[PDB]
Design a protein around this ligand. Structure first.
Ligand SMILES: [Cl-]
Ligand SMILES: [Cl-]
Ligand SMILES: [Cl-]
Ligand SMILES: [Cl-]
Ligand SMILES: [Cl-]
Ligand SMILES: [Cl-]
Ligand SMILES: [Cl-]
Ligand SMILES: [Cl-]
Ligand SMILES: [Cl-]
Ligand SMILES: [Cl-]
Ligand SMILES: [Cl-]
Ligand SMILES: [Cl-]
Ligand SMILES: [Cl-]
Ligand SMILES: [Cl-]
Ligand SMILES: [Cl-]
Ligand SMILES: [Cl-]
Ligand SMILES: [Cl-]
Ligand SMILES: [Cl-]
Ligand SMILES: [Cl-]
Ligand SMILES: [Cl-]
Ligand SMILES: [Cl-]
Ligand SMILES: [Cl-]
Ligand SMILES: [Cl-]
Ligand SMILES: [Cl-]
Ligand SMILES: [Cl-]
Ligand SMILES: [Cl-]
Ligand SMILES: [Cl-]
Ligand SMILES: [Cl-]
Ligand SMILES: [Cl-]
Ligand SMILES: [Cl-]
Ligand SMILES: [Cl-]
Ligand SMILES: [Cl-]
Ligand SMILES: [Cl-]
Ligand SMILES: [Cl-]
Ligand SMILES: [Cl-]
Ligand SMILES: [Cl-]
Lengths: 217, 217, 217, 217, 217, 217
């Protein structure tokens, strides 16, 4: 990574090992995406490729990630056309999509783009593309849909809310659609007892009020 | 985090892993709140969101935390109205509530608000809101009330005090109300033997005197 | 903590985790007090409160510690009366007892008192009070008294000395009283064989001479 | 290693231990090669030889690695003929192939070549040769060929893709040949149900479309 | 500790934990003394007392260590008489024996004696006394004497040499006496087969020659 | 150790613990020698003696190591005769053999010889002697000879090569003799099937060609 006088560091064994263990244990659970970002703070494309390629197994998801990264690289290419000509002594060459992904750019070039003034944060751009692919994978590997989360007859409300917001965290929808799902399905798909209790509260009750209301049930 | 010449560091694997393990092991026990603060010392909103989002499961509590943070952000908004206009070259833009929570503010902007003179410690404000939500969760997940802690007939006084001050630590009440609870319930709800022994001591005996008095019982 | 150009650091996960594990494993054994001090070297009151509050369970002892700290704070208050008036631009405000314990003083104020010339080491004062309370707890949780340590008929002398100086380490008495206890009880409460062997040595034999004399027995 | 003011560090116990454990656990799986590179970032030839020689067992593969490194060293020799003569006071001696591999060059000489201006990155050259040998080993120890990966009658498509791209990751072929293998064999060697489903999609469907199409099957 | 611009550091959790585990696992085996020294490199008397007092159990040995340290302190006192008078502004006070052992000297005073020019390395003096006591303990807790190590009839020579030099490492004797013990007892107390084989070699054979000679036996 | 502005550090707990565990687990396997060197990079004689003396058990091998180091010290003595006279203010005293081994030289003197211009790297000289003794031990504790490694009738070629180059790694012979052993015994001592297959390849086939040729067998 690069940390602040900015200097370049090699990726630590604790970081890489921690990421490998995260993929081994949690597979592709939503919390993997924050952890990944946390473990890639200030990373060069070389460090990002290091983290991705250090994963054994799950090669279907890693190939999908490759294809997503390729799409984003092509979009960057058509959106940023490269200008032909010799680079000046005090200038950097324009990065291609494959240069953002650390495929066709050396570590020195990445340090150059990231640190030198008028910069291009290639590491955070690549990280953005990676996170897009990771969210697509998280969608694909979520078994349940939010529309099928229903409270059991004897299920405590709290556990049902845990399931609901886990599945909702796995759903691929904008925050307004998520807001609608909380607005409708949560109270809609509760068992009749808690459903009546919550319906009596009014359409503007917080989750704390709702959980306190049905905690005895 | 940011540590003192102030410099910005990435969050360490030991810190994040330690927090994840703390939530996995202790669930939402009161001691989680100090640990959290200890693990968030000098953190930017990005690090705080990193710690919160790295938690799998307990998504009901995490959603409640989101709603609490939203309330505090709205209060900050109405209390700090944003002034329209272009920001000067040597000035920072006024942070909104969503900027305090790291939702709508970049890492660079957070470094700017935290370090630059005439500062706004957005990390400690966000941390304050988070701790409010965490205390609400700790209340909700405490099964017992302080009014029901009663010493058993053969229960040693020391264990009863452990239960009493654990449950009391989970109670949501001001320090004066807590002082009243220690003043009344502790001696009130002991078994008749220790109750008589303590009643003989006088209304101004320390906990050490009380525990030494009933340690034989 | 603060370490030497003096700079302020956040408390490390290894330190806090190590302390939590120390309390979990050793409960309130005497060696906990050195370890604590070792883990609090150069700590601010915020770090000390962090270590104390990160302890789950043992809430009777933690409450006793709170009461001891309150007593010491009151003594500091009556011994150091606060002078009313506005603080000068280049001066610190006088710390109250609650400011020493990190209850009513910010981290910035603690850094100020500890680092600025003509200093007040509030961290080491608070640490002193904490250690007083910890010694009181160690007394209360010691089951045996030094007067009851007696060598068994077939017990090797070495194990009896281990028990004797463990219990003695738990005793609350000045070093002169401890010197008297070593002078009298150790030889007094040995089994008749080793008791005769030691009595033949003279009143001025070292522990090495005494243990070598009875190692065959 | 050497990290950026560039300074020379000794190899850390976490790095060497991590590499030894990687070879012990994963044998010669493809992900070993990225990890190795990650653990050798900025390494001198002494550190590379340290990592290679610290491996017990697998001595057939380590000998093959030695022979590959010898071939690359001979090629460097014939491609870079050494010029006879005394080295100037402010100049470095021309490195031989055995000097790149850390066999006949001191640590001081390696620091000299790597740091001094007009440099020769001997560590990354040696690392390149090592990675060539490692890829040859990875080929030799891959049991299956890509031409034999066939979906089972009841095998979910996702697992079949995992096998396919694992074996493909082990294959020694250019990226164009790999592109042809994905273009032909993946759809070719699926079971008739998924084979028909995929054939209906068209010759230009992404892996995400293909996996979503057959996830019910 | 203090490490080189010399600066004072707090003792690390890895060091203290490592020492505690060393005493827990190895009790008082000879290798404990090097480890201790390694873990106390550049330590102040506060760090040394920290390591010693962090040991639970073995309180007989720790008390013996206290008595040894007291003897050495008294010898330092009579050998270095303190001169009465006020200390100059740029001078240190003369350290007493109790000041060397960190009993009656603050951390600041220890830093002063150790760092300031014309220094007194109180940490290494205290460490020397501690190591004297530790060697006395190692003698006391060694069960066997070197005079009783005898090779079994079917015991391989190598194991007998392991026992011999372990027990010899535990013996309290000068290096000339140890040289005599190797010169006499090793060949003297071997079984008749190896005894004849070694006697044929001559009085000037190395341990390698001796072990190679009897490795078939 | 000493690391580059050169500064002296204390040996880390991870390094010493790692070495102790290496000896405990691998005994005296060849890979111990690289690891040792890796863990002693930039070490003073005090650190080397620290690593050697921290080893419990294996005291026959450690005594042999002592005797080897003594031989090398005597050779250094006769090869470097000490010149009598007083040392100048800006000069170092000539190191004896016992000074190289950290027996009769303080840490300060070792820092002096290693850092001061016109230096004598006493740490790397001592390390060289130690490695000589370690190689002698590795020879003595290798049970098999290279002349007895023979492929089984049903043994895969790859495992036989593993045994062959392990035993060969344990052999004490120059690289030309090793080259002859690979040239003759490897093909000589294979089973008749693989022996014929390899004999058909020609006297100039690489190990990769040989292993690929017999991998079906
Ligand atoms: Cl995995
Ligand atoms: Cl998954
Ligand atoms: Cl790869
Ligand atoms: Cl651009
Ligand atoms: Cl951009
Ligand atoms: Cl519930
Ligand atoms: Cl969890
Ligand atoms: Cl909970
Ligand atoms: Cl998230
Ligand atoms: Cl503001
Ligand atoms: Cl504010
Ligand atoms: Cl009790
Ligand atoms: Cl606990
Ligand atoms: Cl206890
Ligand atoms: Cl608290
Ligand atoms: Cl004051
Ligand atoms: Cl004071
Ligand atoms: Cl005994
Ligand atoms: Cl291995
Ligand atoms: Cl393999
Ligand atoms: Cl080697
Ligand atoms: Cl060149
Ligand atoms: Cl090149
Ligand atoms: Cl599937
Ligand atoms: Cl112990
Ligand atoms: Cl022992
Ligand atoms: Cl103590
Ligand atoms: Cl003196
Ligand atoms: Cl001295
Ligand atoms: Cl033998
Ligand atoms: Cl061992
Ligand atoms: Cl061995
Ligand atoms: Cl030793
Ligand atoms: Cl010399
Ligand atoms: Cl030399
Ligand atoms: Cl084979």
């Amino acid at each position: 990574p690069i940390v602040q006088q900015m200097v370049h560091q090699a990726i630590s064994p604790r970081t890489l090992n921690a990421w490998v263990k995260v993929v081994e244990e949690k597979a592709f659970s939503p919390e993997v995406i924050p952890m990944f970002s946390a473990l890639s703070e200030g990373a060069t494309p070389q460090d990002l490729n290091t983290m991705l390629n250090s994963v054994g197994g799950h090669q279907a998801a890693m190939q999908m990630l490759k294809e997503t990264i390729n799409e984003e690289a092509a979009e960057w290419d058509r959106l940023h056309p490269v200008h032909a000509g010799p680079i000046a002594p005090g200038q950097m060459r324009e990065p291609r999509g494959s240069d953002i992904a650390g495929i066709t750019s050396t570590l020195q070039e990445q340090i150059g783009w990231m640190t030198h003034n008028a910069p291009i944060p290639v590491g955070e751009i690549y990280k953005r593309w990676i996170i897009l692919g990771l969210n697509k994978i998280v969608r694909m590997y979520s078994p349940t849909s939010i529309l099928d989360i229903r409270q059991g007859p004897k299920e405590p409300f709290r556990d049902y809310v845990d399931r609901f917001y886990k599945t909702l965290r796995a759903e691929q929808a904008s925050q307004e659609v998520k807001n609608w799902m909380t607005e409708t399905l949560l109270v809609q798909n509760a068992n009749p007892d808690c459903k009546t209790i919550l319906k009596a509260l009014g359409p503007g009750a917080t989750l704390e009020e709702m959980m306190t209301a049905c905690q005895g049930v």
